[PDB]
Structures are given as C-alpha cells and as structure tokens.
Ligand binder design. Structure first.
Ligand SMILES: COC(=O)C[C@H]1C(=O)NCCN1C(C)=O
Length: 291
C-alpha cells in the first residue's frame, strides 16, 4: 500500500481528548516557497477566474506528533500544529510540481514537507450497535478521489492554554462531520478515541487524524437516518456497511482497490489499535481464527 504511510499508532486502544496536548505555533507553519508565494497566488487567480464562487478557508497544518514513553502517567501525545489554508493547499500539495517542492524541502530544510500546506484532515471508523463499520461512496464528478469509497470525515477550519481548545475543536469536528454527512443525532455518538495519524502519498504526504466512534443505533437505523435527509443532505452518493468480523481481511478484498487513501488509513489503524487483541480470552483460536 504505497499511497498510505502511518505517522502515529496510538497506545491503549486509542487516546481520549483529556490525554492530548497541542502546541499551535507559527514555528509549525509552511516555509515561504523558494521563488516566493506569488506562484500560489497565480494558481489561485487562475482558479477564481473560472470558478468565482470558490472561497478560501483557514486549516490546521500538521508539523509532527510525539508520543510519550508507553505506560506513563500524564499527557500521552503532543501535536505540533501550524496554520494553513485551502488556497495554500491548491498551490502546493495539489500542484503538478508537488514532487519538486518535496525534493527542494529535503535539500533546503532536511524536511520533504517544508514547502507543503499539509492541512490536517479528520476521519472516523464509525461502528454500529450491531458491529458494522460505515462506508460512503464519493460522487464520480468531484476533483479528488472520484467514485472511490470513503469513511466519514472532513478538514476542520480553526475557530496547552489555547492548546486544549484546539484539541477540543479536533474531537468536536469529527462528531460534527458525522452529524452533517450521515445525519445521525449527536446523542447517539460516543466521545471519540484517537487511533493514529495516516499520510496520503497521492496528495504529497498530507495527514489525517483517524478516530474510533461508537453509535448506539443499528446499521438499519443509521441507513434510515442517512437516506431520510434526501440527495441534498449529503455530498456522498450512497452508504453501506461491512461487519467488523470482515474488516480484519478487507485489504485482501476487491473493495480495497476502491478505497481512497485516507479511508485505507482509518481501516489499517482500526485493525491495529481496536482489532488485534493482546489477551488470552480474545486471542483464543475460536475468537481469533488463524489466517
Ligand atoms: C465544493 O467543494 C469545494 O471544493 C469548495 C471549497 C471552497 O470553495 N472553499 C474551501 C473548501 N471547500 C469546501 C466547500 O469545503
């Protein structure tokens, strides 16, 4: 799977909000481009002069994420975050010359990402009361990953002493994206756990935080809520469910070739952090079949 790399695998079956610190600092921003940010400005002008209804929006930038020594007390994760924008993304990660910007970042800064926007995405492994995960089909008419399978998520827009509010907006935004797209009531959803962070090598290495969320509704009820919004209530074109039993071997299925990279990230982390039991009971052959 060359189009996805794991930046972080969380311990203890995943991390709650209260165990994560953020450092939001202009030291974590993209570096100005070697020939000037006029190259980003030019791509944006060309785009607005064809699609003048487009808008810029701020985004969180992932710099890095440091896990504490395992088994320790206190905060378990430090997220180093900067700020970027939709416009900076279109002029860097989405650019035809994105591989050249990575090589120049290696040369100039010892960092393949130094000249990349790298907006932080969020995604969920969303489980039902009857032990299915939730999948969405993308429109064949959109620019990114057309007609591919996805999981719920988005790219949160901004607004440890502003740090804790930033972690709160990240956990909040994954629930909000589930309510907006799947049309589920907020009170049917668990507090999320962070499973890890995955990078999309097809989009020049931009990262998504992958979460586990439990719903108290069955798969038949989740479908009813999704469909009852109508075609205008969602960006996706369909919803479907795979038993948690069968997610274990999903990378061996024909479905795998149709999954967008960030959804592959979510399923790998679900299998490693929520699947893959460590104890004698769940590890017994009748409950963990070999092969
Ligand atoms: C229609 O989808 C797009 O690509 C539009 C785009 C935009 O205009 N501004 C920021 C990101 N975005 C949205 C709606 O989130």
């Amino acid at each position: 799977d060359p189009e996805v790399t794991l930046l972080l695998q969380c311990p203890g079956g995943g991390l709650p909000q209260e165990q994560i610190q953020a450092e939001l600092s202009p030291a974590h921003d993209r570096r100005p481009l070697p020939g000037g940010d006029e190259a980003i400005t030019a791509i944006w002008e060309t785009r607005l002069k064809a699609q003048p209804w487009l808008f810029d929006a701020p985004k969180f930038r992932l710099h890095s994420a440091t896990l504490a020594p395992i088994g320790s007390r206190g905060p378990q994760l430090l997220l180093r975050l900067g700020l970027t924008s939709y416009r900076d993304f279109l002029g860097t990660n989405w650019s035809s010359s994105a591989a050249w910007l990575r090589q120049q970042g290696a040369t100039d800064w010892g960092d393949t990402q130094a000249y990349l926007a790298d907006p932080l995405g969020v995604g969920a492994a969303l489980a039902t009361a009857d032990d299915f995960l939730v999948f969405l089909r993308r429109s064949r008419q959109v620019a990114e990953a057309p007609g591919l399978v996805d999981v719920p998520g988005g790219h949160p827009e901004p607004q440890d002493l502003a740090g804790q509010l930033v972690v709160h907006e990240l956990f909040s935004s994954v629930l909000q994206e589930i309510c907006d797209e799947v049309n589920l009531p907020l009170l049917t959803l668990s507090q999320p756990l962070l499973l890890g962070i995955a990078r999309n090598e097809t989009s020049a290495g931009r990262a998504s935080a992958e979460f586990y969320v439990q719903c108290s509704l069955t798969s038949e009820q989740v479908r009813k809520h999704y469909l009852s919004g109508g075609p205008e209530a969602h960006e996706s074109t369909g919803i479907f469910f795979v038993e948690t039993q069968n997610v274990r071997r999903l990378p061996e299925t024909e479905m795998w070739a149709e999954l967008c990279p960030s959804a592959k990230g979510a399923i790998i982390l679900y299998n490693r952090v929520q699947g893959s039991p460590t104890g004698a009971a769940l590890g017994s052959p009748a409950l963990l079949p070999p092969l």
